[PDB]
C-alpha cells in the first residue's frame with residue numbers, strides 16, 4: 065500500500081525539476097538542446113503567484129501517510145492526497161536523487177509544468193502543458209492520470225477553456241496515454257520555431 | 271508612399287481583433303470552432319500588463335505620417351507599387367474620420383521552453399488581411415515580436431501551422447523559422463475538462 069501527494073513545487077524543488085526535465089530531454093532525443101541549469105530554473109520559475117504564469121505540480125510517493133492539510137493556507141490550491149494498492153514492489157535505482165528530505169521516505173515520482181495560453185477562437189484563457197512526465201519505476205499505476213487530472217481540475221476552477229500540449233509522433237506510449245485520457249492528437253498541425261539565434265538575426269534587421 | 275505603425279492594442283480595439291480572429295477562422299477552415307465574442311475578448315485580453323500575459327500588436331497603415339512616437343510603437347515607410355483595394359476598410363478604422371486602417375495583427379503570450387529554463391513567447395495568431403499581403407507587412411509584424419523578445423531576454427518563439435499551408439510555411443521559413451515534421455498537437459476541450467473534474471481527488 066502506497067500514498068501519493070500532488071502539490072505545487074517551490075524553490076526547494078529545483079534539483080528535482082532539473083533532473084526531470086533532463087530525463088524528458090533524453091526521452092525526446094533532444095539532449096543537445098538541454099541547456100537548463102538549476103540556477104536558471106530558480107531565476108525563472110517562481111516570480112508569480114501559482115497559475116498566473118509558469119506553474120509546476122509534483123507527484124510524490126511514500127509508504128507512509130503524508131501530513132494532512134487540516135487547515136488550508138492557500139486561497140487557490142490544496143494538495144491532492146490518495147491511497148493506492150499497487151500490485152508490484154517498486155525498484156527505483158534513482159530514488160536518492162528524488163528525495164526532498166533524505167531523512168524522510170517521500171520520493172518525487174513525476175511532474176507537470178504548465179502555464180496560461182490563449183485559444184483565440186474561444187476568446188478565453190487556457191493552459192498549455194509544457195512537460196508531463198512520470199519516472200519509469202512509477203509508470204502504469206495511475207499516477208500520470210492523476211497529474212493530468214490535477215491540471216484539469218485547476219483549469220475548471222479558473223474558467224480555462226482548453227488545454228493543449230505537443231508530442232513527437234513517434235512517442236507511441238505517450239500518445240496512447242493521452243488518447244486514453246480523452247485527448248485528441250491531431251494529424252495536421254506542425255510546430256514552428258524561432259531559436260535564440262534566429263531571433264538575434266531578425267533583431268539585426270535594419 | 272505608405273506609412274505603417276505597429277502598436278499595442280487597447281480595449282477599444284476589440285472589434286478589430288474579433289474580426290481578425292474571425293478572418294483567421296475562415297482562412298483555417300475552422301469556423302465551426304470560432305465562438306469568440308467581443309464580450310469575451312474584452313473580459314480576457316486586458317487583465318495584465320503588456321508582455322506579462324496575452325498581448326496584441328496591431329499593424330496600421332496610412333497614406334499620412336503617424337504623430338511622432340517598455341514599448342514604443344514601431345514606425346516604417348515605403349512606396350507601395352500600386353493602390354490598395356480594401357472592401358472591408360470601414361470595419362477596420364479606429365477613428366472613422368481618419369485615414370488609418372488596421373491591416374493585421376499578432377496575438378502572443380509568454381511560454382516556457384523548459385529545456386532552456388527561461389521564458390519565451392508563443393504566437394497564437396499572426397495575420398495580414400488579404401488586401402495588404404505580399405507587401406512586407408507580415409515581416410514587420412514578426413520582426414516587432416522578435417525585437418521585443420530580444421529586448422526582454424526571451425529564449426525562443428513558437429507557434430503552429432497547418433501542414434498543407436505551404437504559403438505560410440514559406441513565409442515562416444524565409445523569416446528563419448524551422449517548421450518541424452515530427453511534432454503533433456494534443457488537446458483537451460472545455461467539455462472534456464469538466465468531465466475529468468468529476469474525479470474527486
Ligand SMILES: CC(C)(COP(=O)(O)OP(=O)(O)OC[C@H]1O[C@@H](n2cnc3c(N)ncnc32)[C@H](O)[C@@H]1OP(=O)(O)O)[C@@H](O)C(=O)NCCC(=O)NCCS
Nearest residue numbers: 091196197198203204205206207208209237238240241244
Ligand atoms: C505518458 C506518461 C506521463 C503516463 O504516465 P503513467 O503514470 O504511466 O500513466 P497511468 O499509469 O496513469 O496510465 C497509463 C495507462 O495505464 C492504464 N491505467 C490507468 N489507470 C491505471 C491504474 N490505476 N492501474 C493500472 N493501469 C492503469 C491505462 O491504460 C493508461 O493508459 P495507456 O495504457 O494507454 O497509456 C508516462 O508514461 C511518461 O512519462 N512517458 C514518457 C516516456 C515514455 O513514454 N517512454 C516510452 C515508454 S515505452
Ligand SMILES: CC(C)(COP(=O)(O)OP(=O)(O)OC[C@H]1O[C@@H](n2cnc3c(N)ncnc32)[C@H](O)[C@@H]1OP(=O)(O)O)[C@@H](O)C(=O)NCCC(=O)NCCS
Nearest residue numbers: 297396397398403404405406407408409437438440441444
Ligand atoms: C501572408 C502571411 C503568411 C505573411 O504576411 P505577408 O504580409 O503576406 O508577408 P510579407 O509580404 O512580409 O512576405 C515576406 C516574404 O515571405 C514570403 N512569403 C510571404 N507570403 C507568401 C506567400 N503567400 N507565398 C509564398 N511566399 C510568401 C516571400 O519570400 C516574401 O518576400 P517577397 O514578397 O519579397 O517575395 C500571413 O501573415 C497571413 O496573414 N496569411 C494569411 C493566412 C495564411 O496562412 N496565408 C497563406 C497564403 S496567403
